């Protein structure tokens with residue numbers, strides 16, 4: 001029942017069309033689909049085998065080049081699952097296969113059907129005490145209002161996110177009351193806003209690389225604090241900061257290929273606690 005406790009994870013295999021057709025905020029180097037497929041299999045392995053979570057592996061769909069990023073299509077809090085309306089219209093078909101799996105796990109399903117509301121799960125930070133929803137090109141006020149209406153036990157606040165980013169492109173929960181946050185002025189300005197509207201001031205773990213602030217914190221039975229972070233090969237300066245967590249079981253998980261299409265650690269799984 002502790003924060004970050006999960007029993008199940010929903011993931012989705014990446015399709016071959018990802019390398020060429022997955023949306024990306026910036027032109028860059030060519031995506032190695034084989035290596036990305038390799039890194040995704042290592043990611044699922046950490047959640048499923050190394051950590052014992054019950055993994056629902058959804059099949060790829062070549063017509064949905066971004067279907068690997070299941071986090072955008074669902075926000076899960078306790079037994080309630082919010083099926084979002086992704087801001088990219090072409091991604092909204094990834095919702096059908098996620099809803100089918102979330103109700104087989106017997107969660108209370110709420111679908112964001114409002115044709116004026118968009119929300120990417122990647123814009124939602126759940127601190128265990130409240131929600132923060134980034135207002136980006138993908139997530140609008142209506143979508144944030146619908147999330148607030150879906151989890152009325154928890155406070156919801158919004159924070160402006162700039163450019164083609166998500167909120168969790170520069171932050172994530174690194175532990176109980178611990179927010180990993182980037183060192184840029186953009187990230188610190190957003191954190192300054194979030195700490196303002198909260199009735200609680202969090203501890204922060206500042207990393208020199210915004211993207212490396214995206215980590216997966218987990219509380220596993222008979223293991224305790226577990227954190228998946230980017231490798232020292234990718235972001236050595238931020239990996240050094242994570243090594244300070246002496247009571248965390250640290251796991252380096254690479255994501256260098258999917259990062260080319262703005263894919264981070266939190267985007268590739270929906271974590272669920274089923275008692």
Ligand SMILES: *c1ccnc(NCC[C@H](N)C(=O)O)c1
Pocket residue numbers: 022023024025066069072088091122165166168169261262263264266267
């Ligand atoms: C995780 C964190 C931040 N943003 C995302 N979005 C997925 C990227 C995808 N190619 C897209 O929809 O742009 C995931």
